[PDB]
Symmetry: C3
Amino acid sequence: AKPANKLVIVTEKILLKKIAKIIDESGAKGYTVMNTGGKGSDIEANIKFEILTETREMAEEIADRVAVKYFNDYAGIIYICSAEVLYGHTFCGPEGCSAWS
Amino acid sequence: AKPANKLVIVTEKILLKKIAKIIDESGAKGYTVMNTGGKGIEANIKFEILTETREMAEEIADRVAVKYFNDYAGIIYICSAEVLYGHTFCGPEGCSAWS
Amino acid sequence: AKPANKLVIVTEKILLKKIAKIIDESGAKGYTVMNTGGKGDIEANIKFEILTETREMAEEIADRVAVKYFNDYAGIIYICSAEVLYGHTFCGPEGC
Ligand SMILES: Nc1ncnc2c1ncn2[C@@H]1O[C@H](COP(=O)(O)O)[C@@H](O)[C@H]1O
Ligand SMILES: Nc1ncnc2c1ncn2[C@@H]1O[C@H](COP(=O)(O)O)[C@@H](O)[C@H]1O
Ligand SMILES: Nc1ncnc2c1ncn2[C@@H]1O[C@H](COP(=O)(O)O)[C@@H](O)[C@H]1O
């Protein structure tokens, strides 16, 4: 297994394209996105991104960039969870996530 | 970053309003909720609530489980999380950027 | 609270039933599944979340999925630590 930061961005659904381009520009190998309801009926349409990154620094770069650009004007939260990747074509590399020395 | 518990509640879809009410009264600052499928394929909902303290997450869990989970299907779990940004969650003092 | 492993499988929509069958055959007590988008242009996929009591049960599911499918289909499998606070089946009759 390969350690990973699971970066989660939940924000207003209109920022989808802007945030995807920030993720693409970061070096992250990919991302998962989904529609969600958020309260912060009072529920509104949100989007949640989940981005597994190899380093804490890459996660922080993405978080920082989204927040500095958008979080004055739009509701959102960004957090990280620890994760381990077991299988992942691009995340772990050709030798997979359980490489030996 | 500010330590948080990510409280997850997966349950029957018909409980959405009832559980949102509990989360609202808890002092939690917000929540996410989404339609999901599940087997325990049924129509489910999943709530995600970040809480500042483990006690808040446990009180919400306790309230929901006692009120509904002997009569309806449901699972409640927590993940550790660190909040980097969150205007309401971290408040004015920010997400302790240098802690 | 009862420690748990949260196994997450993101993969192609067509494998929904096939992966569900593998999760069940593993002894896992349940799973959640949802429609997602991903890049890895955004395309439609699915995400499974499976809480397991043991790490080996999570890796058994993971191994069986990846060997059977990840040469031919897009996907990622990862695990997060979790604790279950309430669950009928996960914790048994005496609760978590
Ligand atoms: N404590 C929280 N737990 C979960 N989601 C939250 C929380 N606070 C805010 N959010 C999410 O992010 C938005 C709130 O943004 P903000 O008020 O700028 O933190 C809402 O749409 C929620 O979906
Ligand atoms: N072991 C598990 N892993 C992930 N989700 C679960 C698990 N057990 C139950 N669930 C979810 O919670 C719902 C209610 O569970 P249950 O009360 O066991 O029928 C299910 O329909 C699933 O979506
Ligand atoms: N680093 C990552 N973080 C989050 N999700 C990912 C990542 N890499 C891949 N995925 C998800 O897994 C799916 C298939 O990935 P791939 O097989 O690598 O193209 C993508 O469409 C994403 O939903």
